[PDB]
Write a protein that binds this ligand. Sequence first.
Ligand SMILES: CN(C)CCn1c(=O)oc2ccc(NC(=O)c3ccc(=O)n(C)c3)cc21
Length: 101
Amino acid sequence: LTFCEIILMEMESHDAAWPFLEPVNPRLVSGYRRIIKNPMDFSTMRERLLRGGYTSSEEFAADALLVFDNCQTFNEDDSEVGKAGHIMRRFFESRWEEFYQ
Ligand SMILES: CN(C)CCn1c(=O)oc2ccc(NC(=O)c3ccc(=O)n(C)c3)cc21
């Protein structure tokens, strides 16, 4: 899972990562809690990873993909947040394939 941490750090430093660094505060984003039932973000992933809460790379990847699937459900593809989610998903998938094929 050290390679999960490497990928997480690269995601956290990406130019398109800004929507995903911290949990969405649903008080500030109308409809978020109604539409997205299983929120996820990179800081929540980091807290779990550091504490040993992922028992396989698959569990970590499922949380990453949940970030991107939530983003695609909630936001238009041509919105700033939606565009960022598509970039981040492809970045994740590309880096993932280097360590986990
Ligand atoms: C103007 N506008 C494009 C940016 C505003 N803006 C900012 O200046 O700093 C931010 C920091 C975080 C957020 N996040 C969200 O808007 C959001 C909305 C739906 C969603 O699914 N996610 C994952 C994130 C927005 C901002």
